[PDB]
Design a protein around this ligand. Sequence first.
Ligand SMILES: [Mg+2]
Ligand SMILES: [Zn+2]
Length: 1785
Amino acid sequence: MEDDMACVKDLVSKYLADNERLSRQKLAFLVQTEPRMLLMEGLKLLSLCIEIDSCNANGCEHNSEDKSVERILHDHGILTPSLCFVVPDGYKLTGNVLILLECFVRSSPANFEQKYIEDFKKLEQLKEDLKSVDINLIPLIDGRTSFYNEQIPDWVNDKLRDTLFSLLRYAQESNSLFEESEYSRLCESLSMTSGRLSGVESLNVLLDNRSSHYEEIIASCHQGINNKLTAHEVKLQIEEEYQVFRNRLRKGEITGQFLKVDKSRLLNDFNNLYVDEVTATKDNIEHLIYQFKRASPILRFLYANIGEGNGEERHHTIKECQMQYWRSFLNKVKSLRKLLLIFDALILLASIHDQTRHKCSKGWLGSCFISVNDRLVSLESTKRDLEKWVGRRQQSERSPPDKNQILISMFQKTILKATAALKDVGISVEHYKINMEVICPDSYDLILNFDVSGVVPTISYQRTEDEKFPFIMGGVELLESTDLERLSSLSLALVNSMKTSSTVCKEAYCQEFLLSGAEFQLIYQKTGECSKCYAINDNRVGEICSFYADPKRYFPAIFSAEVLQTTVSTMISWVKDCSELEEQLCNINSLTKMILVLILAHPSKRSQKLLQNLRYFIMAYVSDYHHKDLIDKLREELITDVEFLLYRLVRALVNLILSEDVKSMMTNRFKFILNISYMCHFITKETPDRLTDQIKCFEKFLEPKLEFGHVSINPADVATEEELDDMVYNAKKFLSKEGCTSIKGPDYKKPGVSKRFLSLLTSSFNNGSLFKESEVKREIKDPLVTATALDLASNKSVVVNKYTDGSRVLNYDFNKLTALAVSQLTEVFSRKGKHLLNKQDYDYKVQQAMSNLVLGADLDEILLDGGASVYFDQLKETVERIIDQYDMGRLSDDVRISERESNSEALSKALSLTNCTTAMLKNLCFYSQESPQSYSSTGPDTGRLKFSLSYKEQVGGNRELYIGDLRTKMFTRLIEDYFEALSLQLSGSCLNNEREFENAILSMKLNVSLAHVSYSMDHSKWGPMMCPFLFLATLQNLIFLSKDLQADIKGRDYLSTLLTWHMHKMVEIPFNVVSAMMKSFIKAQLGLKKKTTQSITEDFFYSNFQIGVVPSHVSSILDMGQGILHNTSDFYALISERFINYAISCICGGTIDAYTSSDDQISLFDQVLTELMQRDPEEFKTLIEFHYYMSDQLNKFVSPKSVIGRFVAEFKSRFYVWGDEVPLLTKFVAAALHNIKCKEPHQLAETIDTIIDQSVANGVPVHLCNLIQKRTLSLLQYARYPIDPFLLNCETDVRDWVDGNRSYRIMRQIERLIPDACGRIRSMLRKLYNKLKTGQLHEEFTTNYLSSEHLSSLSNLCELLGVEPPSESDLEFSWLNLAAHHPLRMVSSIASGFVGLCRTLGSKCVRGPNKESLYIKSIQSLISDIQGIEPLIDSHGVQYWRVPLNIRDGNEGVISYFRPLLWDYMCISLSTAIELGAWVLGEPKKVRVLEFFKHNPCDYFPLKPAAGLNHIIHSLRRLYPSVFEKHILPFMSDLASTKMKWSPRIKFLDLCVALDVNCEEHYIVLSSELRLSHTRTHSTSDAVDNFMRQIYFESYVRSFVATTRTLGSFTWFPHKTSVPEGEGLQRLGPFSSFVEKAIHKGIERPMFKHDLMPVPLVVHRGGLWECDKKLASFTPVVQDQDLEMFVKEVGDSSLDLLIGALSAMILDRLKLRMQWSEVDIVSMLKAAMPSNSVKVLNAVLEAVDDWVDFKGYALCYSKSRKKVMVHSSGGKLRLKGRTCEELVK
Ligand SMILES: [Mg+2]
Ligand SMILES: [Zn+2]
């Protein structure tokens, strides 16, 4: 701690600015040693700096020696009788008036105002005495809320504050020094405020251990460049480069790289794309449909001819047998945690009785049957075990009873046990209709006397059995919609197959499903979720099919039978008017369907990619130029005998639509093919297998970092010599690319940058030649001036390091790993390896030997003969010497070198070791116990920056993911925020800003409308080809602030340090990758497997495996964070593209505009270039080529999927054409299908609502939306959850979505249920709203009827408004609301989520009155047993109940849930009418007068919907202080030292807030549906005048000085917000120039007389005054309500204040001849002062002495009579030449 005071003494000696006024306290503090002394002196020093700065900023000389105002005046030459001793903190005199001052710091509005009021009273209590010497006092007060002074660099400031706070925390000293009050005040005084800066400057509190390495790096990145060229040499450089490039290209020495599109050649190249196994050139539709319906066993089963033998049994599905009830009962009671045989015999005899009564053949499959737990039960072993068990039972009895009696007696015990066990909570027994006659007299014999017959089915995993199909091949037709529901039922069976638990021939499982009267059984043999074999069976044939599907990946087909049909129908409807296409429409109507079914039968990644890659082809077919390497990118791979059929289908369809016979409609065909391409979303975005996916990522990551040749395996925490050597070497190499003036010429697709072009770019930026005029008038401010960390809490994972000693581990223990690998492989082998030609053929011997080795003589030679001799010996040695140390439990995690943790856990752990218990950034990485002290050029002292690898799913390919630890994320946030703030300055980016994207859309539309050229660009390998070194090398040569060179130099060093920190990172290799590589090495060492590939990433591992060390971490120079350094990369891209456009415009005579986000980009050409395209094609082509080459020279490549055209534009997947519009009808549907989760069923609803709302606004017709909502409701019903009207509304129209919101739709549904009751309610609500908008009652219902029992609220409201209340046969309606007292208890993939939801909503999940646990069935029973309540079900399924109010009481148990419907309807309707407009409360007028017409399906029509914060904040701080201070001040505010005591109020808004605490840029619709809908019948000037009236009102209560701190301290003020140059400058009178010249520049000084066209100004009542003279004035207009608020707030306690103020206002507004006729007085006084207006009336009217006009009268004062006289024609009394009468007699 001594070091603390030492270093802070050094700081305060050094960085304190020279001023003899600080010398005294400087010394007095720089000498003490006792802590308390240091605390006192230091705090006094800080307060001294504060008061000095304040007195400077106000203009009052500093009272230094702490004189007394008595002395201050008497040594100034005046007489003072006697005063109370006061000490001022500054003062000034001006003639006969005086100015004092006092300042302090408080950081809490509660403990703020106290000092304020205390000081004000301390000053007035002296003014009262001063008044008798003819001297005016003006009590100024100032209230700064932060110790951030001005004579001190702020980082020194907090470095002092925190060390003081720490030293002060001596427990014994703190206790035996003071009490808790001042202790608590001080600790919250050193609060570690976020300050006014970034937080990177704090780097100056560490040791700068930079060395020659950093010097070398900087000098190298700064050597050959020249960032000084004038604006005249750049053009010369460019023109010479262009000349050389053009000339050297014409001779055919550089490659073309761009073709011109010829449609026939494109179609040819697409046709024979796979021409090595698709041996054909043109296929026929008939053979296609032929072999389609027979390809795969699933497809074969779908279309076959089943269900023809259907007689009465097709109708015998409802006449249920007792076996069903008994099985359901057994399954329900089983969950209530030998007996299996009891269940078998029970169900068996139940089926026996059912067969003797009606011969129902159900639940029987050949010679087996399903008993309880989805298990298929055989026959013979059941009877065998039952006989042996009854024999053992009777034997143990005899060691007379016959087995029959034993069996008939062993039922009742368990039956009663079950009937009692279920009766723990709720459900009765009388609902499960189970006839007790099951126990027949001759039970045991009749069970022993029952055999059956049939066929025994069995799964087939061998082939040659799936070629003799029982039924006929093709029976169904495509036009119908029959196959879809077959698919639905089959998929439902598959998903349900995941339900079975472990449950622990021999074993099997079965799941039945019905199909058009028939019944089938899907059987399998292993639980859990993983690919396996299934088999379909029936009780008439056997093994219809067998296949190898996967449980999940089959969700999107459930219950979606009509959705897909309507999809295909409305898709075909697009192209049906092309005459040339008519005679083949039927053909099309087939193909589409087929494709869809295929993509839903077998989902697979390869089909997804194949379908996706078609969008680029169709985009190219319409363009003008394209990249020559395009086609080769669309030829990835294909494997099985299904995808080829898909390729042929899509080829036929493409040739059919795009054939060279058509001219009619290109737009519709474009839209059709594009929507076909977007069908890829229907499949899944998950992964087939995880491990084999976790290797392709590593391959992606490692390969480009070997061709460059820079890899450093296993770096250490302290950098050695060789690493730094090669680092500088590679940094030197990177900057040595060349081209176009050389021998070998340019080489494309190689990472690096050329010095010439880099110097050109930097020098071009440093001339202002890249700035638009609107950007050059606004000088670039330094980004250091502006930080919650909760943003970092976004659920992401965080790595946690691992320590063994004072050091941390960064290596995989080699010897420990091979033991784990060998144990794992013997584990996987010993349970499977005995299933081949065993007994020493070639390989069983070796695995058996080395497996017996680990589990606790010829074979030796037979193994070691092949040279695998010494390796085996050393392996045995190491494994036997490592196993002694211990298991599979210890080494399982020791070899692991890291582990993961959630995001909030680590944040809490870190917060527990600091002083500020909040979330600040600069506080968390710089001042804490675990914070570094010194830093080199390779990171801080605690080690270098570390990341870890993972992958991320996506549609199409996959993305990489780097995960760091806490410190790395901290240090990264700073760079990110710096570059983001810097990039906001310039125009063109679209990554974060919105309005830029809007402008991009507008420009795209405008460009397309005129057939101008457009260029759609996407860059390839944006991640692994950038590097932090490039951003560093381009930063050192940049100069933002050209005026001053003193801080930019200071700022850039920090960022150089941080980028250099990033440059030396360390990326960890995952675990499974290492383990798999080790296994493969061990296997291939002896010779066991294929040994064919040996790819580039295996020898890398092997060359280190066979020499000991294992690769653990990898460092290099050639990779930025893939998804880390976004903002900086975006900045670089923006600069680069602007420069390239500048160059191109310099060469030719055109002009280009650009828009970019991070790597996607769109470029719009101009008139001259479009014209040139048609004159000289060669010139245009060579311009494009030059653009390619130039862009390559700056490390920015171009992907072969970029296009140039005149027909279509594209940017961020938002296409555009001329006239028409392009909806992505398939993407949104596929999104909405599989988008359910496991939450409260009242949240899935709102999620689906948001999705459908977003989809309607793009072109999907509402019919599909209704169908989708109905599908979701059916999905809910399948889980047996009662539907209430507050879930969804499957009846919407277009005006419901365009105008209304969720509440409106629900209100509309309720209206639809029960009309003729809502009528009177709307009628009452009309008048209620009309009376509330003027504030008539405004108090009662919000406190009683919105609070008390709403049993008679409506009655009171209707009688209060005088309208007939609702009739009695209305208040019976209700709706069963579960979760009435507490919410429901609910504590990876999509299917698992659905299954979990189903299982959750089947157990105890409702909270009782206080605390219980009940089912849902039990509540059904309870509500059903009462015989007076009648439910009501709608056509869609919505339930609602009717309960009579006579029985509303007496039975308060079950009735505790039901709620009355009309009450909720009224509440919702009122709240909505508040939120939306008032037009809602009209009546629903529907239109139906229309004649049918030809509705062109491609005809759209845009639409826009029909839509003061200061007042909200005012009301919050005025009404709810506790909630306000903790939720608005820390969020974004500092307004503790701000006044608001004169501001208008609103009653409507007030009661709205009281209730609330009590209780979409366009639309694109079809005009075919804007015709069929419903209808419903029927600031800034404010802010400026608010400020003006605030000032005017305060001017009369007292006197206050006019300065930059007095005015800005108020609340109504335009504090440099979004305000133009002249907005309210007319409404400022004598105050216009000051705000601009002083406040709106950042200048803190008082206002002088030279500020109206050396004494400061004084604001008096209305007019401005100097020392005893008035210069000017100002007076806005007043209202009745404003005067009411005035006399409210001023006339509360005192009276003479109100009298004087009113008299003065009347006087000074009369002598200007202003008019008072706009308002009243007497009624105003009464309405304002409801009890004492008379005496104040007399007082004011006696003060004045004249006449005053008002709202329809005029009064005056009399003196002969001491009363007031009204001017009136009926009076007689004389008063100032006017007739008058009295007021009140
Ligand atoms: Mg793009
Ligand atoms: Zn039956």
